[PDB]
C-alpha cells in the first residue's frame, strides 16, 4: 500500500540554483508512454 507525505509549498524561489542545458532532441513516443531517441 502506497502513502503520501507533504514535502512543501509550490512557490517560485528568486535566486535559486540556476543550472542545466537546453537540448533539441528528436524523439518518438510509443503506446506504453516510453520516449526513445530518433537519430
Amino acid at each position: 500500500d502506497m502513502y503520501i507525505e507533504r514535502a512543501g509549498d509550490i512557490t517560485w524561489e528568486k535566486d535559486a540554483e540556476v543550472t542545466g542545458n537546453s537540448p533539441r532532441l528528436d524523439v518518438a513516443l510509443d503506446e506504453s508512454g516510453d520516449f526513445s531517441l530518433v537519430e
Partner: protein
C-alpha cells in the same frame, strides 16, 4: 486525510524500510502524479484514502479524487523551476531553461536535469508559481544523463 495544497512524496513500505517511489501535486482537492509511480493503485494519506479518478499510460499521468486540474503551459521562451523532491532529501527549486523534444505530433518542452527515478512527479513551475507540467518521463542521452519532458495533462 491531508488535502492541503502543495508538493507530496509518494512512499511504500513493501520493499526494505520506507522507499520513495515518486512525488505528486495536491491542487484543488486533486492529487496529480505520473502513472508509472503508482500504476493506478489507491493511495493512503494519514487515515484517509485516495482512489484514482483518471489515468492514461501513454500520457503517463494519473489524478486522484477528481479530474486533472493543472492547465498552465511553458511559453517556449522563459526559464522554469523544477521543484525537485528527491528521496531522503529536502524539496529544492532548481532553475533551468528548457530544451525541446521534437515529435511527429509536435514539440514539447524538456528539462535537462538528472535526478533519481524516485523524483518522478516533481512539479515544473512558471514565474507565477503555476504548475506547467511534471518531471519523470523522458529519455537517456549519449552522456547517460536523463532529460525529462514537461508532461502536462488536459483540464476539462
Amino acid at each position: 486525510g491531508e488535502t492541503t495544497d502543495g508538493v507530496y512524496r509518494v512512499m511504500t513500505r513493501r520493499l526494505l524500510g520506507s522507499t520513495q517511489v515518486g512525488v505528486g501535486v495536491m491542487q484543488e482537492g486533486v492529487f496529480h502524479t505520473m502513472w508509472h509511480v503508482t500504476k493506478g493503485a489507491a493511495l493512503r494519506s494519514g487515515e484517509g484514502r485516495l482512489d484514482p479518478y483518471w489515468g492514461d499510460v501513454k500520457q503517463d499521468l494519473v489524478s486522484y479524487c477528481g479530474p486533472w486540474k493543472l492547465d498552465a503551459a511553458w511559453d517556449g521562451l522563459s526559464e522554469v523551476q523544477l521543484l525537485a523532491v528527491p528521496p531522503g532529501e529536502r524539496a529544492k527549486n532548481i532553475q533551468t531553461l528548457p530544451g525541446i523534444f521534437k515529435t511527429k505530433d509536435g514539440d514539447i518542452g524538456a528539462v535537462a536535469l538528472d535526478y533519481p527515478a524516485g523524483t518522478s512527479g516533481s512539479p515544473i513551475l512558471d514565474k507565477c508559481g503555476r504548475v506547467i507540467g511534471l518531471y519523470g518521463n523522458g529519455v537517456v542521452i549519449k552522456n547517460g544523463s536523463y532529460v525529462s519532458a514537461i508532461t502536462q495533462g488536459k483540464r476539462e
